[PDB]
Structures are given as C-alpha cells and as structure tokens.
Design a protein around this ligand. Structure first.
Ligand SMILES: [Mg+2]
Ligand SMILES: [Zn+2]
Ligand SMILES: [Zn+2]
Lengths: 50, 89, 1166, 53
C-alpha cells in the first residue's frame, strides 16, 4: 500500500522528490539530487553515529 | 492613629466617597487654607479629616456649602475692583 | 463659546488608516539618507535617520552648529542649518517620512489572516501576492470586451488580449496594480448590487456569504477609510530617541534594530529612484521594487515573509510590530509589570508584639523610602537651611533626623505585598513601626492572607504618596478593614497554629489536677489561683461568672451564675468582650471553634471589639502556648502494639490468594484486586489502631483506681486542635504509610510496611521518591494553571462593576439547600445568607410576612427563617439583573470584608475572578481541569442528548449511522426529527412520553443544551452546582455570587431570531438588544420588537468581544486587533478598567467612580 | 510556482534570457552605434544647436 501511495517510479524520480523536499521551490538537478542524497546519510563528512 | 474607619463609613455611606470627602477636607488642612475642627493629637491631616467625619461635623454637604459661601466672600472684596473694569465698554 | 484647539484633557481615542497627506502632516522632514552620525564628531548627518534639522537639537536648547547657545533664543530657526532650539525631548516626539518610489503594500493588511486588501476586493490572497511579485497581470475596470474586472492573465495572454483590444481594456501588475484596483473600487454600487443579489436567489450558501460581505463593505464605507490607504505611498519614520544610537563604555555604541531596517528601506528606495532615472531594463527595476516591498514589510512586521537578520548577528531583528507586541505572551508593560519608585522589599520575620494594624519597618528602609518627605519636614521645622543641606544631613544620618522620620511616619500608612498575589488581600496597608534591623516584621494573623511562610519569603513595600493614596490605603487596603475573605463571609484573621495550640491547651480538662472540685468567686481569682501554682490550668471546677446578652433592644442585659468549667477557660474568659455568652469559651477550643468565636463576636459587637478581641486572642494564645511547654520527642509518636500482628495476618491473606493463583482457582487480575484489597484493609486497620491508641490511651486515676480520657500527648494535641498535622500525616508517622503507585498509575501490591518512626529501607524510599517528585511537579503546575484560570476570569469580567443602585426586578433564582443524595451536603442558610430576597416569604400560615420583599438577609434574618421551617427562598442574583452594562448593588448581595451591603462602584468582576482563583491551588472527570472545562462550556467527549420537545416519541428509518427519532407533540406539529446514531445505547422509551430536556441517553451534557432546552436559570444552576461540587469536594468555601457573575459574563451575547431593527442571525449584547426591544415595545414602531435566543460563550471566547480596542490589544493577539480595529475606524471611548489602566488615568470604579460618572454624564449631553 | 523569497522570482526571471553569441554582441553594439549616431546627426541638423554653441 505504501507503494500504492508512492508518486514515483524510478531512482532518479525519487531523488527528485527528495531534493525538492529538502530544498523546495528551486529547480531540481540530477547532480543536485544525487549529491544531496549521497551527502545526507552516506558521506563520511556530513554523517556519523560514531 | 485610626485603627478602623468603620465609624466614618457610618457617617457617610459610600466608603469610596468617604475617601474622597476626607481627602478634600484633608487638603483643606494640608495646604494651609483652613484649620482643624477638632483637637489635633499630632494626627496628620489624613487622620484629622477622618476624625472630623466621625464627629459628623464634616461631609460633602457642609464642604460644598462652605466653599459656596467663600466664593461670595471673595466676590464681596473684589466687588469694587472688578466693577471698575467697566472700561470693557 | 470657543470650544478649544490646543491641549485639553482628552476623551476616548480613534484609530484608522493613514492618508499619505496625514503621514506628511506628522512628518517634519523627509529623511533622505541611510547615514546616522558623522563618525568622528558624533553630530547627526543632516537629513538622515538621526537628524538635528528634521527631528531636534542634540543637547538642550542648543543649535547643532553651535551658533545660538543661549536659553533665550528658542523659537529661532538657525540660518546655517535650520534647527529650532528646544529641549532634546522633542527628538523623542517629532516624526518623519520617506516618499517611496513605487507603491507598497502594508504587510499588515496583506497578511492579516482575513486579508483586508483581499476580502475588500473579493480577491484571493495568493492571487494578489502573485500580482505583487510581478508573477502575473491583473485586469482593472475591464470595460466591456472579453474580460472580468478581477481576472488574472499571464504574459502571453495579456499580449494576445492587448493585440485584440488596444483600449477599452486595462491591465496592470505589481503594487501599482493593486492600488489602482482599490482606488477604482466603488463600494456603494457594490452595495446596491449585493442587496439585490441577496434578495433574488434562495440558497443558504449564497445569502450567508452575501450578507456577510455586504455588512463588511458598508462598515468599511461608514469608517471613513478609503481602500487606497492599504497601499503605502509614504512611509513614516519613528522619532530617533525611540530607536537610539546612544554610546556605551569602552567607547562602543548600541542601537535599536529599527535603524538597520529603516536604513535598508531608504537605501533600496533611493536606489530605485536612481534605477528609474537611469532607464534600467524591466527585469532590474522589478527586482528592485520587490526588494523594496520586502524591506518595508520587514520594517513594519518582520517574519511574515523572510525574517531578515541584523548585521553580523544571526538573531532576527525586532520590527515595529514586535515593538508593539512585546513578549511573555501578551504583555504590554502595563500588564507584565512596571517598575515603581518609592518602594522596597526584604526578608520577613514575625513580630508578635505588633497590633494587627501595624508592621515592623526597618530603619534604613524607612529613611530611604520617605527621603523626600524627610527633606521637606527637615527644612519646614528649620533644622536644615536648604534642601541640599537636608540631603547632607540625612546622608550624614545626624541624630535629629530620626525624630523627624518618626514624625513623617506616624499617620502615614505603607503598602505591603507578597510574591504570589492572587486575591486582593495579597496587598495590605499597615501603620509603620520603626525597627532596628534589616528585616520586615509582619503581624502573625496576616500570614494566612499572604500565604506567607517564614522560610525566607520576601515582602515588598510601597509608599502611598498622594493624600488620596494614604486615605485609600487607610480606608480600604487597611488590615483592620479587611477581616473577612471577600469569597465568603468567614474570617481570614483566624488564629493560625501556635496560638490555637495555646487556646486549646488552655481550655481543656484532664481527670484530676490541682484545685479539682473547688469553687472561685470569678475569673480574677481563678487566674490568681493558677499563677500562684496552687491550681492546675486544666481542672473541673465551678466558678461564678458574669455574662451579658445584648438581646434587649440595642442593649446589653447582665446575668450571673455558677458555671461548671475549668481554670483555663475561666482565665481566658477575661478577654472575651461584652455580649458573648460563656458558652463559647467553655468548650475544648479547636481551630474551628476558635474561629467561630471570632465570627460570632463580629456578627454581634461590631468591628472594633472584634479587632481588639482577635489581638488579645493572639497574645494569650502565644503566651500560654509558650508556658505550656509543648514539644515533640521520638516517643511522642506511638506505634500500635498490634501492628506487627495485623501485618502478619494481612500477609497471610496474600499467600492464601497466591496459593489459589498457583492452583489456578482464581485469575491473575482477580488475584491482583484481591491482594490489593487485603493490603488496603490492612492499612485501614493499622491506622484505626494507632488512632485509638494515640487518642484515648491516657489512663489516669481520680480518687479511684482508674479512668480514661482523651490523650494529653503533644503530637495528638497538635493534630486535634487543628494547629498543625493531620490524621493522614500522623498515620504516616506511626502507622504504615499507604500503597504507592507507578507513574502508570498501577498501584503496587507490596505497600510500605515500615513508617517514618521506624526506618524505611532502600526500595521503600526509592518508591516514595516518585510520589515526592510527582507531588512537587503537580503542585508547581497547578499554580500555573490557577494563574492562567484567574487570568481568563478577570479578562472575561473586569469592567463589570456595581453601577446602578437598584434595577428593581422581582427576578431571581430559587434557592434550596443542596440536599444531595444523602443528608444536606450544604444547608439553605449558607446559600441564602447575605443575599437579598426577590419577594416576600411566608410562614406555614400566611398574611404573615416574616421577610418583606427585598431585604438583606443577615444572620438574624436567616435565623428567623431558620426558626420557621421554610425550605425555600427566591433570591435576586447578578445573572438575573435587569441593569445593562453592570450590576445593581441591590442585586449583588452584602458580601465584602464588611457585613454591610455592597457599595456603589466597587468593581465586582475582578474580586469575583480573584475569589474563584485563589483557592485554585488547593484543587486536585473532576478537578481543576474540570473547572476549566465548565467555564469554557466545552461539549464533553461522550455527551448525552435531551429531548427537543415534550410528547410521545418513537423510532424511525434504519441504520445509516443514525436511526432517526420521531417526536410527536400533542397539539403541535410533529416534524422535529433528530438523527441519533444507534450504535450508542439509548434510554428513552419507544412507547413513553418524554418532556423537553429528558434523558434520551446517558453521560454528561453540554451546557449549550441545558441553556436552550431548559433555560438560563437551569444552565446557570448547572454551572454553579457542578463547579461548586468540584470546589466543595475539596473543602473550598466560595460563595455562589462570584460564579454567578462569571456566568453572567458567559451569557452576555445572544443570537436574534426575529427582526424589525437589526440583522437576523447576529450574535450580540443582550444588554444592547434588551435595551433596544424595551425601547421598541413603545414609541418607535408600535411594537416591532425582535426575538433573540440566549447564547452560551466560554470564558476564553466571551473575552474576545470588548468594545474598547486598547483593551483587546492587551490580552489578545495585538497585531490582529490593531488592524481589525483600524479598518472599521473603531473609536474607543475607554469606559472600562483595562483601557484606563493602559492609558494611565483613574479607574472607572472605586474612588474613581465619582470621577468617571461625573464625566460620563457630562458626555453625550449639554 | 513562486516560493516567494525575491531572490528566486529574480533568479528565475533573468534565467529565461539566453546568453549572447560572440557575434550577437557586435550586432547589438552596431545597433547602438546606429541609434546614437542618429541622434547626434539630428542634433547637427538643428540651427539653434549651432548658434547656441
Ligand atoms: Mg514558603
Ligand atoms: Zn546652526
Ligand atoms: Zn439587578
């Protein structure tokens, strides 16, 4: 059902919705969505649970 | 010292108008226009006025009357002075 | 006569929108530059936010350039740089302006929740904002072509439409657009058309909105406001000293945030003028216009767009809206508080030597406080040459000044106040007594009123200055003048702890003591017998006494007799004044009895005797308690010998039920209940063991072998007298303490077996800790809830004041004893006491009027009613009062610290709110939140429903989520049918008749229903009875009066049904309405008089409506109130308390009631 | 569509305009020369413009 409410289809689309979620109103870019999403929880720089 | 004001409140009903009247009379004493109607115990004008209320010799009626008289008492003096202002014509 | 032009003592106030020309009228110059000060010579750069020319001279009576320095040249405008030399204070006054390049929306009227520009134009907000940002084009005065007047177009669309129609069509964009829209708008024509459209089409949806909007429009027209003024052509600049640049230590400067904002605005403005003169491309000048809009918005009210930040500092900058609003919720500096001269404070101590009319005031404190009086009194007697020398003297603290201070102190009262001020007794006036020390001494009997412990609480002193303040403090706020709680006629001066242990120890009797059985002439030789050590304080003895009864006519009868009493009672009798019978002192004298002594004394002898009586009671209580040698040891707390056995047996029960759970005879939960019950029973048994043993165990011999009486043990005497301690706490000391409960509220089945006299071990203490922390938390929270509640209360009441004398209506509520379910949860006598009778009442036989129509029922009248069997009295109330915009004193009641009828002009709403509020700390659906729910008139979660109309009912249709109920009135039409969800179990009988307001289901019911289907008396009775249930369950005494005035404020507004003057469905004042239909019943239309329907508004809701807007701007959301008032051009006449408090003149109540009245009649007259 | 925050309604509004080719700059500049020289010549054809000087 979670999928039944999912507006997206493919990776790039989801990344678009996420990038437009975090930084709304400004035009989304591929490199932008990728960079943001990779930099949120996956970067050694911006993320640590230690 | 007046420990309770209840008797003065008996003499004039309102108890707010008591504060007002007593204040008026109190100023009649404090600014030196007049003198007490009852022996001063070293009681300040504040309490003297209230004692004057308790004795029933001071209230709104009496004060208004007295003032109304004094108006004409000044009119009596200034009569000849102000009637001399006929230069107005 | 020439009325006037220049300064008078003003009345009312007016608020409205501001014309550009008006803004110019205020402006004494246009600030053209962002510059502030020159940066070396700190002089103001001319025409800048800080300016000498526009605003004023930097220093007093001195030109900026320095040419004219003399106090002579004044009205002179300097030739070099024009500055009229005048006090620097005028730089705190004179306004300024800025002429903006492009028009600008005033953010208050754009972003106020009901957007003013938006609903005036019937244009949606998002559209308007889309227009202001140059994100689209909007039509103005479309003429007849293709297009609506308010229609919005895009770039390409505007181009196409323009190509089609060159003229006879118009479209703009940006601020100029909206301004052009507002200017073009003709309100009157819209009025006509909307009246017509209202008339033609029948739909609820259509004519609701139609009528709302037409009313809005015509109100705006009547205001005098022209819509254009919502768009700012000119922007006023605030006076420099109200946003100062003033220097600090280290040579650093500090300035208000309004300077950054104003600076930004001026900058972008000038840059826009520049960009216009440079013929810039559209994309640029548009950006600049937008930025200017943002800057202006940020200046006026910041945070409705971007929340701009101040230079180099992250924290957002405070705007003018934030200047007005303040902080700490809604506080306008007359609200949160204001610092005050001639004041002080310090730690407080006892001072039992004091009479109740005085207080110890520290020497130094008195000197500093009365310093100006001292200066004047010093040179009046001629001890000091001049005021300077006087200062030198009091600073030197020369010997002679102390006497002068004793002079200025004598008849001059001082105001004493404590930290949590709730009821009016939180501040009391005292006669100062000079004391060596830094501590304030406060009379013990007053400690109850302040709720002041001695554990380091502080009190603040305020010196009444003006004569009127001295006399107010002495005749009103004076301690001796309030002996009785305004909430209920019972004395607040009741002896507290040590004193009552004294009087209790005094009159009490042991079985055998020195002087047992002998006889004495009178109290004198009784006391003489005691002090000589011959006779014991407590011994059964016959002594002759002379008592009095005033029961003759105004006259004291004398009677003498041999009374069977004790030595102590005989001694104490010496104090009791005059007409009181010896019966009052011949008892054991507990706290309650020792209080009723005072009460009776007051209701018999009058004020003064009661005062001095209480004084003597305090003195003797302290002295004899001191003599008594009462103490507390570890052996004073006696544990039951049978305790361990009870523990053991009750511990056997748990292993019984445990064995049953092991064998499975009983379920786990049932087991749980069983064990919990056996342990609870155990605690009850131990408590009722230690209570018997502690209470009666004194076993003592008189001439025989044995006799037993009530114990003389210290802790018992303390708990019994009412001095301190209670059965619960004593139970915690000797007997085991309770059963605790986890934060969940699941009560632990292994209670604390040990007590405080014994030790508690680790676990027991840990478990007790939660109870402690939750206790402190809950109490400290209920303080806040109390405060909030009182606040809502005075907000809803306030301006209600006794105004007229007697409205003279027979109307009132039926007063019966509360009679709940058992016997008499509260008598009739308390409920009807001090209350005026609505009409004459009867004996069982008649044409005999005991109480004659309207008469204050005092103690004698109530006792006369009590002699006869009368169960019922109809009583006038504040809720039923015919008087509009206030209560008549004849309706209210007598209640006050004085037994006489309520004075004309006392503000009752406030004291009612306070009276309800103060005990609120002592309240535990039920509870204080229940009280709040009641006063908020909140529809409960699972409410019942009452029969809409009387007559036989039955069930209809089916199961759609509602199974419909059909009611059938006898004579009248049936059609009333209500949809009752059938999934709720019903009550009402399908075959039986049900009266209107019967139970068609179960559960609590919303008081809206009680008001509509039962009616006003029924609803006020429901509220008062339920809230009084809550309070009285906690042992709180509150007279029905205060609750009834709050109730009156709740129902103040009502909705009309019929017509002939004003609109149909409007909620409005029943004062206004009733005074209008009473006026309409004759003259006017012969009778056109409308029918209304009484409405119930919650206290927080009813507080919303206030005539005065200044008042509303205090406790409500300020930003909205100011706008909403400004559009209507609302004119605030003051007339209330809060408003006059804000504006800083005399309160239209109390002493000021003579002023405001005399002025009120002068108004609207010749 | 519009997040407000005027930085955006600018950034997007200017971002529509297309970047000039290296030749377009010279086309436009030539147009500039054309216009100006037209007003200069129009000034030279006025007698009072001479006499005044
Ligand atoms: Mg304390
Ligand atoms: Zn000058
Ligand atoms: Zn009334």
């Amino acid at each position: 059902e979670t999928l039944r409410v999912d507006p997206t289809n493919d990776r790039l689309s989801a990344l678009v919705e996420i990038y437009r979620m975090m930084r709304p109103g400004e035009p989304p870019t591929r490199e932008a969505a990728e960079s943001l999403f990779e930099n949120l929880f996956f970067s050694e720089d911006r993320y640590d649970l230690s | 010292a007046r420990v309770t004001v209840q008797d003065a409140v008996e003499k004039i009903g309102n108890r707010f108008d008591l504060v007002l009247v007593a204040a008026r009379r109190a100023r009649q004493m404090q600014v030196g226009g007049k003198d007490p109607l009852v022996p001063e115990e070293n009681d300040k004008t504040t309490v003297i006025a209230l004692r004057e209320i308790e004795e029933g010799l001071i209230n709104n009626q009496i004060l208004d009357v007295r003032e109304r008289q004094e108006q004409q008492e000044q009119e009596a003096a200034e009569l000849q002075a102000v009637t001399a202002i006929a230069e107005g014509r | 006569l020439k009325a006037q032009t220049k300064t008078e003592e003003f009345d009312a106030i007016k608020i409205a929108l501001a014309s550009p020309d008006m803004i110019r009228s205020w402006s004494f110059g246009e600030v053209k530059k962002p510059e502030t000060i020159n940066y070396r010579t700190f002089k103001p750069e001319r025409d800048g936010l800080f300016c000498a020319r526009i605003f004023g001279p930097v220093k007093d009576y001195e030109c900026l350039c320095g040419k004219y320095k003399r106090l002579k040249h004044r009205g002179v405008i300097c030739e070099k740089c024009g500055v009229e030399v005048t006090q620097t204070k005028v730089r705190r006054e004179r306004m300024g302006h800025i002429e903006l390049a492009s028009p600008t929306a005033h953010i208050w009227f754009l972003k106020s929740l009901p957007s003013r520009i938006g609903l005036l134009l019937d244009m949606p907000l998002r559209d308007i904002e889309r227009v202001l940002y140059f994100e689209s084009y909007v039509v103005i005065e479309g003429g007849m072509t293709n297009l609506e007047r308010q229609q919005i177009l895009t770039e390409e669309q505007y181009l196409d439409a323009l190509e089609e129609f060159g003229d006879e069509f118009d479209a703009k964009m940006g601020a100029e657009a909206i301004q052009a829209l507002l200017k073009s708008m003709d309100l009157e024509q819209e009025c006509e058309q909307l009246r017509e459209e209202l008339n033609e089409t029948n739909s609820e949806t259509k004519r609701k909105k139609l009528t709302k909007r037409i009313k809005l429009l015509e109100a705006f027209v009547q205001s005098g406001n022209k819509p254009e003024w919502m768009i700012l052509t000119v922007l006023p600049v605030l006076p420099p000293d109200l946003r100062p640049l003033v220097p600090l230590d280290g040579g650093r400067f500090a300035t208000s945030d309004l300077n950054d904002l104003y600076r930004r605005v001026i900058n972008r403005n000038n840059r826009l003028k520049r960009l216009l003169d440079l013929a810039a491309p559209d994309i640029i000048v548009r950006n600049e216009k937008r930025m200017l809009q943002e800057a202006v918005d940020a200046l006026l009210d910041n945070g409705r767009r971007g929340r701009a930040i101040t230079g180099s500092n992250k924290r957002p900058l405070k705007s003018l809206a934030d200047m007005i609003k303040g902080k700490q919720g809604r506080f306008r500096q007359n609200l949160l508080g204001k610092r005050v001269d001639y004041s002080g404070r310090s730690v407080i101590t006892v001072g039992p030597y004091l009479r109740l009319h005085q207080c110890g005031l520290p020497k130094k404190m008195a000197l500093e406080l009365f310093k100006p009086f001292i200066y004047g009194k010093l040179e009046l007697r001629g001890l000091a040459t001049t005021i300077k020398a006087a200062k030198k003297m009091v600073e030197r603290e020369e010997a002679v000044v102390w006497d002068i201070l004793d002079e200025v102190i004598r008849e001059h009262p001082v105001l004493l106040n404590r930290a949590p001020t709730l009821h009016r007794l939180g501040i009391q006036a005292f006669e100062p007594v000079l004391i060596e020390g830094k501590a304030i001494q406060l009379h013990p009997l007053v400690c109850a009123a302040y709720n002041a412990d001695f554990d380091g609480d502080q009190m603040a002193v305020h010196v009444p200055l003006t004569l009127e303040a001295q006399l107010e403090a002495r005749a009103l706020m004076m301690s001796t003048n309030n002996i009785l709680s305004p909430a209920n006629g019972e004395p607040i001066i009741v002896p507290s702890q040590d004193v009552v242990l004294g009087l209790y120890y005094m009159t009490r009797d042991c079985v055998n003591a020195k002087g047992e059985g002998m006889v004495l002439t009178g109290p004198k030789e009784a006391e003489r017998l005691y002090r000589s050590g011959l006779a014991s304080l407590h011994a059964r003895v016959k002594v002759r006494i002379t008592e009095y009864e005033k029961d003759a006519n105004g006259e004291l009868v004398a009677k003498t007799s041999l009374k069977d009493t004790t030595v102590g009672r005989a001694i104490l009798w010496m104090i009791v004044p005059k007409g009181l019978p010896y019966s009052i002192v011949n008892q054991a004298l507990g706290k309650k009895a020792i209080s009723k002594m005072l009460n009776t004394c007051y209701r018999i002898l009058g004020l003064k005797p009661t005062v001095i009586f209480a004084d003597q009671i305090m003195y003797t209580g302290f002295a004899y308690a001191a003599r008594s040698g009462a103490s507390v040891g570890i052996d004073d707390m006696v544990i039951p010998e049978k305790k361990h056995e009870i523990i053991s047996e009750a511990e056997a029960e748990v292993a019984e039920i445990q064995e049953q759970f092991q064998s499975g005879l009983v379920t786990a939960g049932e087991r749980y209940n069983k064990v919990i019950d056996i342990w609870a029973a155990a605690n009850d048994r131990v408590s009722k063991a230690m209570m018997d043993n502690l209470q009666t165990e004194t076993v003592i011999n008189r001439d025989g072998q044995e006799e037993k009486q009530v114990s003389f043990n210290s802790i018992y005497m303390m708990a019994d007298s009412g001095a301190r301690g209670s059965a619960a706490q004593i139970r915690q000391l000797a007997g085991m303490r309770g059963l605790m409960a986890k934060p969940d509220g699941s009560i632990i089945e292994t209670p604390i077996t040990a007590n405080f006299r014994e030790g508690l071990n680790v676990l027991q203490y840990f478990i007790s800790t939660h109870g402690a922390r939750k206790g402190l938390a809950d109490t400290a929270l209920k303080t806040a809830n109390s405060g909030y509640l009182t606040r809502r209360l005075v907000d809803v009441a306030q301006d209600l004041v006794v105004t007229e004398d007697d409205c003279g209506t027979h109307e009132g509520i039926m007063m019966t004893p509360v009679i709940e379910g058992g016997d008499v949860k509260e008598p009739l006598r308390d409920r009807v006491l001090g209350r005026v009778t609505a009409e004459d009442v009867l004996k069982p036989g008649t044409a005999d009027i005991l109480v004659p129509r309207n008469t204050l029922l005092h103690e004698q009248w109530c006792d006369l009613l009590e002699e006869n069997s009368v169960d019922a009295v109809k009583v006038r109330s504040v809720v039923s009062c015919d008087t509009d915009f206030g209560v008549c004193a004849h309706c209210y009641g007598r209640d006050l610290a004085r037994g006489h009828i309520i004075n004309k002009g006392e503000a009752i709403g406030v004291i009612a709110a306070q009276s309800i509020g103060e005990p609120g700390t002592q309240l535990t659906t039920g509870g204080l939140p229940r009280v709040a729910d009641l006063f908020e008139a909140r529809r409960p979660k699972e409410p019942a429903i009452l029969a809409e109309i009387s007559g036989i009912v039955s069930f209809g249709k089916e199961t759609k989520g509602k199974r419909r109920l059909v009611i059938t009135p006898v004579d009248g039409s049936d059609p009333y049918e209500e949809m009752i969800p059938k999934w709720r179990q019903l009550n009402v009988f399908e075959g039986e008749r049900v009266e209107r307001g019967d139970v068609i289901s179960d559960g609590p019911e919303a008081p809206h229903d009680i008001l509509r289907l039962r009616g006003v008396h029924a609803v006020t009775r429901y509220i008062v009875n339920e809230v009084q249930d809550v309070y009285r369950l906690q042992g709180v005494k509150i007279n029905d009066k205060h609750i009834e005035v709050i109730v009156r404020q709740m129902l103040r507004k009502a909705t009309i049904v019929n017509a002939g003057s004003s609109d149909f469905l409007e909620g409005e004042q029943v004062e206004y309405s009733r005074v209008k239909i009473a006026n309409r019943e004759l003259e006017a239309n012969g009778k056109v008089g409308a029918t209304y329907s009484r409405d119930l508004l919650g206290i927080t809701k009813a507080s919303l409506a206030t005539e005065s807007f200044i008042s509303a701007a205090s406790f409500q959301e300020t930003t909205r109130v100011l706008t909403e008032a400004a559009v209507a051009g609302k004119r605030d006449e003051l007339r209330g308390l809060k408003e006059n408090v804000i504006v800083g003149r005399l309160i239209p109540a109390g002493t000021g009631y003579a002023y405001h009245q005399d002025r009120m009649r002068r108004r609207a007259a010749g | 569509g519009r997040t407000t925050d005027p930085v955006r309604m600018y950034m997007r509004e200017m971002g529509t305009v297309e970047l000039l080719t290296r030749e377009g700059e010279i086309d436009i500049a030539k147009r500039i020369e054309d216009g100006i020289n037209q007003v200069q010549c129009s000034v030279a054809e006025y007698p009072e413009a001479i006499t005044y000087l």
